[model samples]
Target chain A: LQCYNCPNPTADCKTAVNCSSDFDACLITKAGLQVYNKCWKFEHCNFNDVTTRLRENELTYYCCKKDLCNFNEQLEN
Target chain B: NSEAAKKALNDYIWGLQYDKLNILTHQGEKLKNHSSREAFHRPGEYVVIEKKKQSISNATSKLSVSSANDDRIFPGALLKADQSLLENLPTLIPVNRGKTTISVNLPGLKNGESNLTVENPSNSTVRTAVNNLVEKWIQNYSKTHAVPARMQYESISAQSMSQLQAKFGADFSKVGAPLNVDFSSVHKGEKQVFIANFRQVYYTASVDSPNSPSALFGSGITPTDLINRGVNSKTPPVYVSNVSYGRAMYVKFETTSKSTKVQAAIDAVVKEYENILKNTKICAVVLVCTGNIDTLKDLIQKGSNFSAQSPAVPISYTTSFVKDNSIATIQNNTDYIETKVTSYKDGALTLNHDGAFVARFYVYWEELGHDADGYETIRSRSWSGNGYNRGAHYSTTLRFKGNVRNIRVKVLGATGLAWEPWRLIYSKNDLPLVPQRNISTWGTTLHPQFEDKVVK
Candidate 1:
């Protein structure tokens, strides 16, 4: 599926990758800045499943099942 | 004044929408036929009348911001150190710059004249400087000024006369007879008899509230007040007055068209409604459309391949507000149907309507297993022609590929116009999900202080 996976604040890239058996489109992020995404296995897709990995000013990952759903840019107020 | 300036003023006055007789002076003449028109007032008289109308309009109506581009400094932009350390140096700065646009001078005989004064320091400084020079000349003239006699006038209320004079001016007045001016023009420096008339009318109406459009549109109304009145405000939530909120969409057809085209349009519109539902909080949707009702009913009933598992009810066409174009009243004979989301669950969402209608339901979700990358859509379903039990109940056992932050389910149903169902959002821990579509377009943001707390 078509998706965006970038390690920079501003990614000049849109990528595509075939998922293995039972994978979903997902977006993972570092803090709220840099973002990356790809097909994630169903076992690792819920937001509550990753809260322990989040820390102050550190990276946190969120997953959802929609095409290119990762938000890699800073959100506006 | 040059012809251009005079013409500019004339054009500006003519641009105003009011009766023609407003800008003319009618000596006590006998009633004339409708065809005979009055003559234009002298340029100077027109100016004075125009000013009077402006004064009245200003006093009665609210003014909008001169420009949306006005620079706005947000809170905390200005600190005490930014200003010179004078006494009371730490005064709060306003987020928006102050404006002093409306100004007027009304001449009142015996009572006294009234001049509107604005006291913004930034604006007042410049005005004070200019007025100081004019004060020297005005002070000399005030020593020998004499009060003039109030003139007798008749006809429309001072406000109405001002509306006409201010709007139509000379050209409109020249329309004559049926459009003759009921009020006389005032020469400069004279007692404003119309002001006195206006005051009298205003006081008389004070006790028994009158609905005056011009008065409501005039000054003293603020933006917040306008918002509360729903002027330029976003559409209110559905069911604001009832248990759940409801929304209605009005579809106007230029003319009766082919059934397929109408059906396609209905589908597209429902899709839009569903898309909107994904972002907003609306529980019910009512769709109103104008067109051939029979064709629409036929497509939903026996003519089309689509079907809801239940027996379909015959279409009932009724006339209401969505009917004709010139209809200003809210109540009219328009055809519509109402539907609401009746069920929501992990794998399914359902919407039902009264048994008489058939509707299409759209279910979207992340497919479980290896297919979880893209959203999956359920085939559209219609309600069975049964009792209140009629509707589509969509459920899925799909799972996303990764740890799910949130799952968005958007359900939209449409039978004709009335089937346009609505939007409901479910996010993890109440944090709104970043829309899967149009990241660049939405430009979502969050305050720095609420960074980690809010979902991206």
Candidate 2:
């Protein structure tokens, strides 16, 4: 699977991560600003540890089970 | 796979410039949770890729946006003359039902002498009541207290879904549903047009307000969740903090009639609270216009047959969208700026010596624009080790555009242990404030226009 990867929201994607297998594209944001994206293995899909950081007008994350779903002009890893 | 499916997958991967040989097969394998250092994978899972096309049209009217995340402290310089200014602030006394007022004392030329007063008449009938209140609050206060002038206050109103389309033209009407409420027109004008929709609506007073509530309940629905839960379901609750003195809100209800009546109720609630804190100085006032009916109903559920008659105050606008153009400083070219970030394992002396390792560096820029603000990764450089005595070293040149306001650098190194903490780099000096525009307000400054003779 092909997925965009970015380390932070205020930067563009450094490069697209070519997933080996069993991975999906995930996108995260803070107040509508796209911050992070990457290919995650099925086991890494559970983001309970990070959900506490999700608050309105704050940081939030969403994941999708598709190739390149997180891809955008500024996608990063 | 069939020819069409093969071609579809090929095109998708090709668009990303990914190598065909790199695509691994994961037909059957159990998933396992692994640390950041492990490469987890499985075989035989078919990748699903479907692409959707989107187009956004421009609008004529400008939508103004307030600084939603602005949590600036009230200037101390203004209050220096009267150390007790905050203590002497007049209470917002209730004037009538859903109406209130306040009068703040401003320092005069002579201490304890005749002083100026800043009055706030928060009457529901006043269309610009909030603006009027803040205007005088600053005007009188500035006489004694002056540092940097506060950002000018701008009136915000909501527009109907139809009105939003009308402003952007029919081209926008076609693809309006899929568009984000924060969406703005690409067209140019001296005055910016902002929309107040799902993306701009608020459920609380302000995010930075001392005792503000959460925009969503534990169940994920807002107060008016049931009312708009069906066909007319609206956007989720999102409170934009620090936009105004107290808070900022936009009214978005299922029906237009109900939406129009609740503005006064909200305004009254906010004004009432501000008055209660008479001793505290005022900086901004809440718009008090969320269409969350449960809250409004509890506050003004007294009229019979929904007659709810008190003096009629016709509303000029409803829920819509546009956004603010608040600028932030990122970097400056005045000083010779240069720095580098390095990482090594805790126990090891050198990084990745005699081990497989990789390191990556990045430079990011947040480019501001009239319609939308977004970030760009302008530079990316990486280094890899070859199982010998080694430490990865790499740096990339920072690139930006005219609209860029902030720039930052990040680096991450991974050895046999794990990916280390990211090192952030920034210059000591901030970007110049209100820097001279190198481009035109509506177009690039370099787009020159010249008269030419027709070849006849």
Candidate 3:
């Protein structure tokens, strides 16, 4: 997973994941606000992913509003 | 005659503005519409004529001579007294000489008819001379004369005419009709009208004179050139200009094109004022352009490139007036009346009925030495001795003296020669009395010696 923080007078949060290709999610802020954050989320082979999270300085981001309790990945390669 | 002079002079001086002080006085406020429309904006056309009002305090007085004794004396005084006695006279002989003011006569009046009589004498000798000549003339004339206003120097009052819109509501199409003061050329002399029009709109004054333009141009001149040298050139006369007072830049742009061009022009002008804008002599930059409002949405929007932290400096184009008692004192000493008496008792003196009233004289102010006319000069004390005692201080005085011999005690509207006119005479003669003309002339001086001061 990959996350990008946009530094602007007004900004938005973005997250993307790739197995073959993961769905890209982008959250935008309007009018008078700023955003900055970066994160990547993934689970190991045979592990189930609860949520992909992205957060900005303010809690206005949807990813920050939802929580994934914890992520543990175990793999036999 | 005396009252006519004041009325005329007041009419003349009423519109004067001290452009310098106004920068502070009229900040972020409404001003006369006439002033706003007249290219009175800062940079290009701001306060052309600034009243450099030199008061004892408005000035920085160093010891002109450091209280040192002077060796010079008057030529005649030198003949009478030795050099030592002359040196001891006074450290300062008041390098500033006495003033002699003059008033212009009504247009089309003849030359010899336009005579000069001193109102107040600089010394007792000058006073005695003015008194003796005037008393002899009044004594001979009062016996034969029946009325006073026939003297022809009478001043007509400026009629205040209300706007038709006030009476008839927003219908300005009917505005030009039923003017209280006749705008017709036929009734011209009945009113004193002033018409200065670069653009036709509201009339500034109702006083009429074909010569108003000439007089307007003549208001700023030096005292010496007006009185001593007789300089009457009107090439560059008194000038006044203003845009708006203390306020933020308010641009009401109608279209984007107009706003963009205006903003660019103002930006250029502001850059030109890199140094001058720091000075407190200009007021504000008001941009008004008419078009479609929808087109101007983002034209005046704030941007970081211009820097909100560094806003445009304030322009001090507005000014203030002396509302305090200071003007009262100035007016008191500016005008005077000298009467001769046969007997003195208590605080009053008895006058001879033979020539009860002698002459009415006036100090007429002619405009000169204003910066608008390019006559701005620093004082003599600043550069050297020559520059110190010149300009308005040494100039701007002209004299128009007249004899009031035809005036009588009855025409003056008093049993004695001392009653106010508006009540004493006007209550009865306020009507268009064929005989009241004389009373009007004599009663004209009724407001003199009152402590009224005029400011613009």
lDDT of 1 by residue, B180-251 (tens): 223322222121111111001100000011122211122343434423533221221100000000111111
Better of 2 and 3 by DockQ: 2
Best candidate, DockQ = 1
The residue ranges of model 2 lying beyond 4 angstroms of the native Cα positions read A1-77, B1-191, B194-399, B402-456
After aligning candidate 1 to the native by TM-score, how far in Å is the CA of B5 from where it should be?
99
Q: Write the per-residue lDDT of candidate 2 for residues B1-456, one digit (tens) a residue.
A: 344433442333223322211111111112233222111111211111111222222222212223220111111001110111111121121211111222222223244222222232122333243344335434564455532212222222323233343332222333333323431211111111233221221111111121112201112333233223321112111111212122222322222121222334334543343322222111111224342434533432331111211111111111111011121111111111111111110110012111123433332333222211221111221123222232334222222333333322233334343343322221221222122212101111122121111211
- Ranking, TM-score, top scorer first: 2, 1, 3
Instruction: Score each candidate by Cα lDDT.
Output: 0.25, 0.26, 0.21
The complex in candidate 1 yields a DockQ of 0.06
lDDT of 3 by residue, B1-456 (tens): 544543453443334333322221111112222211111122211222111111111111000110122122111001111122112222112112222222222223245322333332133433343234334434543345322111101111111122111111112112223222343321122122321101101001011121222232223332333223221121111111111111122222111110113234324432242332222111111212333332222332321112212112111111111111011000001111111111111111111111122222211111111123332211000001211211111222111111101111211222324544222322121111111121112212333121111111
DockQ of structure 3: 0.00
TM-score of chain A of 3: 0.23
- Give the least accurate 10-residue stretch of model 2 chain B, judged by summed lDDT: B74-83
Q: Model 2 residue B379 lDDT?
A: 21
Candidate by candidate, in order, the iRMS in Å equals 10.6, 11.9, 41.0
Best candidate, TM-score? 2
On lDDT, the stronger of 1 and 3 is 1
CAPRI-style quality class for the chain A–B interface of candidate 1: incorrect
